[PDB]
Amino acid sequence: ITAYSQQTRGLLGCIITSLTGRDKNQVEGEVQVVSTATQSFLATCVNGVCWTVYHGAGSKTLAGPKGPITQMYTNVDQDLVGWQAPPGARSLTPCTCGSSDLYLVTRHADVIPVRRRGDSRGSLLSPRPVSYLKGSSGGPLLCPSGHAVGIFRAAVCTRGVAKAVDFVPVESMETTM
């Protein structure tokens, strides 16, 4: 269960694309590194929907080939938003395993092992500082088979060191749909 990061564009391109809402870049992969002119986070594609956090994306539209992709789903209460995935985006599938051995995928393509300790919680096998996880919201929590368990939402930390992760569970992404 390995991962690697690829850069698609710079900041100048990100700003102009943010303005026009028209993105003719080739889309590939399941985890999209998404950005605003100010903030950067992640977006995971599950069943043709590009899912991310509300605290990062807001009610903002997503830059697409035929123009701005309007939000298909907006749950402020669950801190979750979704867009119809842009062409080329490869999709992830919900987990049915019921496996407690989870894996969080970060913006720096690190596959950090998590151990499920509730519906929306999972403990970190090796605690990481809050900075290591910053900008990885919307990132996926994978089962050992590589199926979507949830989307990384918030960090459960004690004085700067993250000991666990809070995530939006796929069941709630299916409930939204």
Partner: peptide, 12 residues
């Protein structure tokens, strides 16, 4: 403005 794709994470 709109949320922009600026990179990707490819999974094995």
């Amino acid at each position: 403005g709109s949320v922009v794709i600026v990179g990707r994470i490819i999974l094995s």
